[PDB]
Amino acid sequence: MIVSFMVAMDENRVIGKDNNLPWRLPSELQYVKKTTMGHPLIMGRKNYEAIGRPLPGRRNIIVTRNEGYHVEGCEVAHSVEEVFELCKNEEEIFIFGGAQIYDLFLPYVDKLYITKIHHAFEGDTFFPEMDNWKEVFVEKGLTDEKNPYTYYYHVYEKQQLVPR
């Protein structure tokens, strides 16, 4: 099962503030929605609560220590093992939100769906750093009136290597 990340980022690798996104990008969010369509959404509790509601078209799997955490139209996992368990028959998943959720799926990550907004915002949350990788795709995001920022979509798959 392909373990993919889906993050929208910043100049300073900002991916949030008190809980929500510092930017308002309906186009970006559409590219997000389309890309992950058909695949589960792996996201932490405070993250999903930022999102606000179950994103349709995909298994909404949530992560939390809380054994007694439930939320309608959503699956909940207390372990990475329990996510891999749930998504055992999945061809690909998308790690979505919570900087600490990334660090849990870090050891397994396969593909990186990183958006980079060319600005410096004020944010509390940030994205863990990484050493590789290998960019396979790149496209600029639509800067409109409703997308008042310049940002590009960046895809990264693991860098191979020629046997010594």
Is residue 97 within a helix (H) or strand (E), and if so which, with residue range?
strand 92-97
Residue 110 binding Ca ion, by CB under 5 A:
yes
Phi then psi for residue 145, to 5 deg, are -95, -35
Residue 49 binding Ca ion, by CB under 5 A:
no
Residue 75 binding Ca ion, by CB under 5 A:
no
Is 99 annotated to bind ligand?
yes
- The residues that touch ligand TOP, with contacts defined as CB under 6 A, are 6-8, 20-21, 29, 32, 50-52, 55, 96-97, 115
Is 152 annotated to bind ligand?
no
Is 60 annotated to bind ligand?
no
From residue 119, alpha-carbon distances to 28, 91, 96, 151 in Å are 15, 34, 21, 8
Look up residue 78 and give its two tokens: 């207390």
User: Least distance from C-beta 29 to ligand TOP, angstroms?
Assistant: 5
Q: Give CA–CA dist 9/15, Å, rounded.
A: 5
User: Least distance from C-beta 110 to Ca ion, angstroms?
Assistant: 5
Is 114 annotated to bind ligand?
no
- Number of alpha carbons in the 13 Å side-chain half-sphere of residue 161: 6
Binding residues for Ca(2+) are 108, 110
Query: Which residues would be at the binding site for Ca ion (CB under 5 A)?
Result: 3, 108, 110
